[model samples]
Target: LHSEIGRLNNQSLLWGPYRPNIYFGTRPRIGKSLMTGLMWGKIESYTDFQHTVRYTCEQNEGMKGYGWDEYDPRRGGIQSIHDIQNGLDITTSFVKIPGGAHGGSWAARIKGTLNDDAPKDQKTIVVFYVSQEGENSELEAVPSENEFGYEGDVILKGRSEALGNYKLVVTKGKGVIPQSDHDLSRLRGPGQTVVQSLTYPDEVLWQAKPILFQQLKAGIDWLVENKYDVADPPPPWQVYLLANKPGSGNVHIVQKVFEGDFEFDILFSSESAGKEVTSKDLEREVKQATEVFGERFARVFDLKAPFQGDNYKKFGKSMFSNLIGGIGYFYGHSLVDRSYAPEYDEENEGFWEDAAEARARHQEALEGPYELFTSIPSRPFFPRGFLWDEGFHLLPIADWDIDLALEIIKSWYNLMDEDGWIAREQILGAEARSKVPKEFQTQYPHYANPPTLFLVLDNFVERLRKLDETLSTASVDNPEVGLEYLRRLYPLLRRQFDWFRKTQAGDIKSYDREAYSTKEAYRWRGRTVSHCLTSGLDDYPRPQPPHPGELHVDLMSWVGVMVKSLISIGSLLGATEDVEFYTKVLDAIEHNLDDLHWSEKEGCYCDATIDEFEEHKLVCHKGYISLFPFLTGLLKPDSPKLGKLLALIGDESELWSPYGLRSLSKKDEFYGTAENYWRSPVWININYLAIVQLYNIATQDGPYKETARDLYTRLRKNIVETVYRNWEETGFAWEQYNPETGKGQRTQHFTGWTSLVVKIMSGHH
Candidate 1:
């Protein structure tokens, strides 16, 4: 019933930039409303603008303030314009404010609210302006000072970055509620209506502003002009911002639009408005959302697979649709300042003559003035982009919309530094920073997320080669555009791969007595207590403390897959030398995985730690750490090693479970003993990979085909059914599932990697 700041609900408002930070919402039955972003500054409607709303106080730079501000004492900030009681048609759209002092920082919002008693045509648009305080005072209105015209059209010159030098006229209707003599805190009544018109000359180069202003102006006219004339209203209006920068002319900026209530209409109980909202009502809404989601799910993705039953189809469709709906959680463009610390080097620090000299050099590279990242993750809980999570998020989406998938991919790659490092976690800007604890805010250059990006590129290549006949999009429909996209992306991929090899490579202590053909092995750099967290399997448990000379089987397997993907991409782009070069690298990786990491006695690949003599010893943990070869497709279809891996997957004493594949093996002492994460939980992303690999070998000339076939059917059904039953009972798509109980666990609304189940169900696999 409350519109508290930072609250992310199913119907929460997210619009504007591709990486949006602002979120908006109104209290139940349309009482108070609030919008918060950019350094904790906020705008709230205490009572429909019929009563006075609070304003932000003084200008403070880099300080974070949250929720609603003080009421009685006058302060300088944003004032709520209007609040609609029992608002019917709530709509919002993003408009590009022209670049000025704060223009680039400014994002214009045109929100519409309709009174319950009013006709559909009589909707009121509240034109609101939002910007960081000290930067620009254009949108600021002092409570006690400043004059606002209440009647008729009034011309106001641009003072803030929004308009700057341009001139615009705002038309106010006769509906303004009379102001009271006493300064009030809250009020309730019918809200006023307003419209805006641009008066700037056509010759002026308005940049991205005029286009947005005109569209909004047209929308206002369109809303009122055909009042009661037409039965079916037009769909939500969209405003597009273009990236006019040279070299990126081909790609347009993200299209900002207002989505109608079609998606959440099932949750809205119009007849029961004004009744005090209750937890039971919320649960009812959740139940209806799932039912309606299934209905809409059938519209988008029908079960294309041959085998089907009514029970499976019903629950499976609901789970899949709810996952698809999780895309609403996309948010980004966080500015992080880590410039306070310099990078550290352990090698030089240990033997320096002076302590100060050693400390300076050790802490040199850690600090960068700042870094910016954009991301999209599961909604409600994690409403921001996660580096490894995003790669999996784009997998199934690429099949539905390749253009959007490519755009998000390019955005992430654009954040890579000169050294080719993209921070594993992106905690940008003050608003985004508020959600995280202070200790975890900073990012390191040495840390590495999973090579999920390579996995995404692998799927992208598969789609590009097939002309993506299944996905109907301009880029996929046109081969030239697709190749151009590849051309633009190939260099970034290669450079990032180079960075991975150069930075994360382990030590080399050549010994002729070693068993491997090449006396070389590798381990992740910056290995500490939780150093392997970047591997995206946090808390998987590794050797205590950090070891520089240690080797990780999963790291090597990931690089093998990365280079394999690069080889495929290079061959497609006609890069002859890259293909031939990586072919050898791939062959060497195959040899290393077998010669260095594989333990013949244990019949498993294990991580290694260097001894006092600098010799590598196996750290046997039969879990996901051991399944990298199969997960990354390093094993050939007919290889006997592939048979052994398939046997392990099918063995109940190890990774197998009635629900799905467990992250850790049951046979291990550490299994399910530590943190629930990566201990003994079934993660859909990895399980999906297992399913894909099984199908991969089944399609080839492999003796393990029957074995792979049986495991694939049984495991795929296990995952789908497990998720469906839990979702039906709890009405949630979980972050991870309990391996033993087959129940939903962790983040309730997490749909990030869990949606990969679509790949298994689509028959396209």
Candidate 2:
């Protein structure tokens, strides 16, 4: 588990505060020249900052050019496959710069061999540099003139145009060549030209020792204080000397020298550091973070059932590790513009034309040009903060680190519009835009993304209310914590609930008893036959076509849960008015749920379509849509519908599958049709929620305890074993699994919600 997470983590580069949704792959070809982003660079040989030696090491006696291998640059036509393990790490990559093996180009004229394998005349050189996140932007490295030499060392001060000021200092080493009459051509052989620039200083081969920089003093101090410091002669620091020339973009070539391993540190801060930023001046605080995070995960490991072999523990560990890795991969923040909609094509097929028209209508109401900061769904495919995915992602993390989880939750809520709408998908910033197709970039103001954010908020408030008094800390657990956090968030949640009611709620047609009739029922708007995609269940069969007057079981259940959560939180905070208001809302939702959605003949809660005559017809396609009532905890423990729902889950012909509960019932006509998404596949996130609900029901005294226990065991074991078998065979966590064959499907390495398997394996839910 540790090795896999470490490997995946090294494959990614994390530098900036708000741009972790980056991958070193091609598909969309977006990640290049990132500001506060890191990529690979090459090197020849360099003496000091100014002087650099360039020589050919190609074994093949032919003209060669620089090329891109994957996302990194390959020099001199060298294209053999290499691994990330070849590079040394100091929070970034320092790939070994290659030279001729022996009796090859530049071998005869090279100086002392770099290592055992290197030619006696040649030396391996590596370079490192910092740049902006995107291309077409320039970053300058200014040399420090005032303090050229400080603290018995030679220092080079370099200032960037985009990134703040930094200093590069090189300490003297024992193997020093004389500065005067040092026969520089021996290092730079005849017919080999030396590259020179004025951006940063360059000098001849002095073979000096490595020194830590001035700006990094603060970072090192903090690490020491927190007992997080690496011992001196810490890993070899990749050297980044910023260089630029006329008619070219600025480049920082990172060099690797095997003879003398260098150690350098960099501390980034907003303050102007002529000297060094002290610990007191540093704004970031990470004290006790490692211990706290470690302890919480240990507790999670302790909660797992030991009924099985080591396979159980292995699966649990991998889930926790991958989920933790995924959290780092999907974090991002950006500002997006909604006015730049994709162009509409005029000449198209009927289906395409209809889609275009609907898209145009959706775009006509687009809002934004606003800032968004939230967690995303995935790193490779969907690498931008998604409203629906973030909600599910937070559930596991909140229990581990409440403050960190709340930080993201608060950022998402802050993006809520005046009307309480937050865009379902956030494709903000140019880097984010490059990943998505242009046609789907514009975010519509009217659309919704399953309102899963409420799920996260509800879980957050619950954790706070049950805060462990002994583990109380200033950041999270403390006296008045629940009331304070809820008080701050109460207004925001209410406004969002109000917006959902205003826009998503449909009007009453008539009160007549017919195929399609209802009075004062809640319905979702902005749906189409091809897509009710905004509900986060794209292509889950609703009506044959699409109707704005349709009352959906899932949508109402979601709102019901939101109202219920708000009422509970308000009561906890002693907010009498808020509690009373939400209580009525909950009562109204319950009344409509029974009168409008529940089908006695079908034995489930289904969607309803109302016509002009107020007649209501139940669309009974039994699947995930039917279970939201129980899943959302809306049914009373003694309610008859609760028993009926439990029976359906265990029935082999319906929702139950050997792998886990299917998204659609097998007996239903739309069982395995469509794209197989939301058809009859098992998704871990929803299954985890069902497991949780079942566990809660088992705690109550009734037939539900027996039924819930049996169902929970079957569902949890099926889901866990399916995931484990697939991962063992394929070495990947998938977006969903085939219910019939237990085969993994779609988006491999999809750690987003699939990480919920951790909760299941923990045996807590």
Candidate 3:
């Protein structure tokens, strides 16, 4: 089954820097098989080896910025790393040749930029290497043509079942500084190009920087021992390369010590065992692909008038590109603890306390070599599958590549348990589990995350609706594919939705609250006094007492979202029986939201909790939570509730900020208090949802249409300006923005949902 699908799946992920943590790392969907990386550092200072020698995108590197200038998943584009400390700009351009047997062929054009005032003869050692982590993968060096030194073009023949018989051609780079200056005359001149076959354990191999220098020290020690004329005067570190010793040398490097303003290309040909096409051919393809990416991006997002700055356009492309490029292909077993208790244990009192004890102990059983093709949140930090984060990540992805989006969605639903639950975070393997702390490792079947995957699928249906069957084309742009996709995905989607309803149901009956709908109210299951981790708003302020009778408005709103999505999907498939049930659920959820959770005194929606007297009391912390009913499109455009929501959102003293709407209102007791995470911050994903609904209301003929239009325009501008300014200032798209300063904080390179700026920037639907 995997073999049939693997053929199509392997094409899109043929070559990419999927290792988002590394500065530049490439691997295929197949795990532990083969890996490639680029490591470089300036040799100007001896002490700079630890700092400037860059491989991974570490926070301590103190670089100005680094990201793809232009990129797409199938095609390739240029990525720029501005190393301000070294006064160097490095550009890595990757391109692909799709017609090949195993995976495909590709090429990389790596170059460095120096300041105008800097010497053209400056040296920067750039090491482009490939390593094999799995067995039966072998790469061996071909004899160099330059006998004087290991100079000239370096070629390596590689044999792997997944990669087929391939060859890597290193185009003889321009301008190599002479190695004759060092006392070690044995390693001298551009002639000193001995390709060293390297060997290392799997753990050491993945972290490239440590091994690059570890080998450098070993090589220098060898020369000293042999009395090969080497002094302690910095020891020609630029010429240092890993020595060939191990029989199974699983790595090959095409090392280049380049001068300022230098460039070179590494061509990988999967078609021929020899170089069939030159680097020049790959360059032409790269140029064409880059141009096509531009055309498709403009058409898909379709930017309109106003906020059309040239710089904004580049920011839009980089943000969207990295999000796509950040897609990771992970395969391995996950850690899950299912034996502790029942999935519906949240139905009783002290659910939070009981669950905490279960969570404190780990019955960690490995669940599967669950193959996942997904994107991560932040590269260096959170480089794993985050379920709800992925839903918003798919918002832009589905807009660009529908097939890729479909494949990813299918991969996620496949991970769902038979009883209808997917782990909120997919720490599928040891490598994946290592990125997260031990305290957060094991996933429970009882927990629930926002059903935002339905939100993504719902958006897909809307876009398809926009692309009406013109009655002109006989083809109809292949609607059958999606119909069939939904057909296959329907069972899983229904199961997951039902799981949310069954597991997270709240006790509205016990509290005797007056509500339009009795069973529609719901609460997030794994709750704490201050943290509802399962809700996805980790630090979002919750009611202080943590009552078991709490009815969360957002969970009710999410049910509404799921109900709408389920109905639409079922209707498309002529599964009208399911559609009717979901239709009723949607209507009931909408009614319950306003009746049970609306706070007239606070002038917004809120969570309902039982007080000490067992009375239903509204917990109104006016923020993103208060806007859920509207954000989920549950409220009517002309409803009086919509007017109240608009007032709360527009109030400068509370939710509204010059940057964007703060996560919590400034007037709330918990505003900017304690951890100050969700309490007082501007998250673009929530901000994105606000403007989308605002756009929806603005288009409708409602009494408050002008207010909707005015708010959408201002809020849209504020979000883009804040994200753009911070990205420029710090060279990163951040996790959240400080409300007071509009400064990006928390996780950096968070091209996840923060990339929603692309859609927000698009002045059209």
Candidate 4:
């Protein structure tokens, strides 16, 4: 039972802002759990009043910046928001207290800072609403009676089966409790909408800015027609009466028109079954969670020389914190088409155009709204799980919180279908699907993302094997726990390994090219003239016309990575046959990589495809795809290809960049073409792999060791400096950096795989 709550159940993930769409909001991972949020607006400007009520995170708000300054995943963190337009700098400090029958307790200190140039008397209306009540909620008051407003340590109460009876403990902060005429009406429109819109969360929550205005405009038309006095009556669209009794509503409106800088505390305490919570416990955990954040962060990601100061350490904290803080517990069904067909193998000409018309239908297409507890790629963009991205996310997370990473691994594996096909992207339910474009919502069964999670699994297994020998803390205490996880997940991992073997296999026998192994070469499905979205590189530029005869070098490399992972993990599980089977598969794949995909002319790996004559053609973009064999560690140190890959990595005209290794070679025709996303940009994830491989090869005694070490030194410095510089310049961590100038661009707050910067800073092994 202790183990269940302590680590195995992902109980560490019990509390967090899973609502990545929101500016600042949190709930336990439990479904239909009680929720609390932070939002405040300058009431002085009545015109921009409701609109300024910052609830959900909107990119258009163009928040000058907002992110955790210092954060530790297991403990808590401080997130500060720079609202340029509103002239309010908000600080949200989240501190969690562990140990409970249910997920323990948490406290948030919400403070508003007026910009330096702003007026002394800035009328900012700050609110802390109970907002949502699960089955456990009951009214608990201390100082006053209901007719006006309830005042208490335990305000509006709730707790449930998922969580025991937990009380909403709040201090009567220094503000007006809207026990009057004007404040009462204020609570009616903006208050109810802000609180309840999230109560029944949907698209309205994400596109927070527009929906508030659009909804309030539509809902208030009846009020405009009736034109009643301040003391007014109601109708069927009497939704205006939602917060009729301002004091009685779910809102704890400390409606403070801040005369100056001010702060307040809202504590969410859920007592264990034994009821061991105190009034002091709320503030107790807040500062308790704070001091340990910097302490814990420094220990886990111990920075060496030049980067050891608080400046670099604090920067690293936020990057890693928000990445971990952005960990979401998404609950919902995926839109799936179980309809796999022989015709589904789109090897024919113009396959994409034909397939674009074929989509999962409305309503019926939705399978179970499977609650996938996973980490997000970004808060504002791509906020759901991407199959491949999750592994990159788990990389740093496992180093800090081992059990947490292991549990999320189980959550992802749980998503695998009966046939072992986990959809490449997890766009689950209307809430998640709404944020995505209609075209990208439905998932194809045949598609496969890079088996990157296997790498993370391998790391976990190695750490498990080395548990007793290691320095530093371990999130999971017992070696048996790790073995148990490997034992149970082995079959699921094995089936998916074979799922890629069968489903995404390229036509090896149909063509005439002889390779080392014919058994398990693979390619991405659902490709077009410009994009292979399933490949997870987006637009790294693959073979044109998207042929069935095409084979990807990268796909083969990952399967090699996957097979070796199974071999390592299988050995831990004591499955001898499985270990040998995977070992053989790995050997065959490693050999085939050279024969089937290597381009002797290009001197690096190339994707193989056939022409109208059915003769073999090499589609070598000479970028990431070229480096994959080495990137996945498929190439041994003594292997001859390491020399070519090393040269490709070191040259200025190719994959090497000032920022990090660019996604595509500068000499390529598609270097900076249409959409230009993955073409010439330096994405952090792939570069992380490059650096890791470089570091490994550098350490090993090989002929290329000197060049590998040099590249590792320069590349690691280049990556850290660029990311650090970008973070300092722009308050948010960016999705991708410019290959040319090292500027932060594209998706902002993309602390997904980008957080791997933390591991890189720690000098990844």
Scored by lDDT, the top model is 3
Those runs of model 2 whose alpha carbons end farther than 4 Å from true positions after fitting are 1-18, 23-35, 40-129, 132-294, 307-314, 327-358, 361-371, 467-476, 510-520, 610-614
Give the TM-scores of the predictions, in the order they appear. 0.64, 0.68, 0.92, 0.89
Please report how far candidate 3 places residue 50 from its true position, in Å: 3.4
Instruction: Score each candidate by Cα lDDT.
Output: 0.51, 0.52, 0.77, 0.72
Clashing pairs in 4: 23-57, 136-158, 136-159, 137-157, 137-158, 138-157, 332-369, 332-370, 333-368, 333-369
- lDDT (tens digit, per residue) of candidate 2 on 380-477: 56756778788777776666555546656666787787788787777654445656676677666556667676776677666665622122222345
For candidate 3, write residues 345-429 as lDDT tens digits: 7655566677767666666688787978888888778888888899899888877776677778888888998889888988876
How do the residues 1-765 of candidate 4 rate in per-residue lDDT, one tens digit apiece? 335443524555577666666677776676555656566776553256666677766565547877777665456677888886678888887776767767666777777778997676655665554444444443333323433233433354554577766666555454433222443344343222122222323323334335334544654664566464346533212232222233332233333334567676666667673444454665676677766665666677997556777787877888898888777777667877766644468877667765655542332277875877788877777888888999999898888777778778888999888888988888776667878877567777888899888988878777777611121133346666566667788899999988888888888887787887768667788787888888888888998878888899889888888888888877777789888888888888888888888888888999888887888888889788888899898888988888988989899989888889988998999999999998999889999999998999889888988899999989988888889999888777888899888898988888888889888888848
Q: Candidate 4 has what TM-score?
A: 0.89
Model 4, residue 81: C-alpha shift (Å): 1.1
* Model 3 quality (TM-score): 0.92
Q: After superposition, how far is residue 548 of candidate 4 from its true place, in Å?
A: 0.5
Question: Which predicted model would earn the best TM-score?
Answer: 3
Candidate 2: residue 529 Cα off by (Å) = 1.5
User: In model 4, which runs have C-alpha deviations exceeding 4 angstroms?
Assistant: 1-12, 60-62, 129-154, 175-259, 271-280, 360-364, 467-476
Worst 10 residues of 2 by lDDT: 102-111
- lDDT, residue 456, model 1: 74
- How far residue 758's Cα lies from its native spot in candidate 3, in Å, is 1.4
**Runs with alpha carbons beyond 4 Å of true place in candidate 1:** 1-300, 304-375, 467-472, 510-520
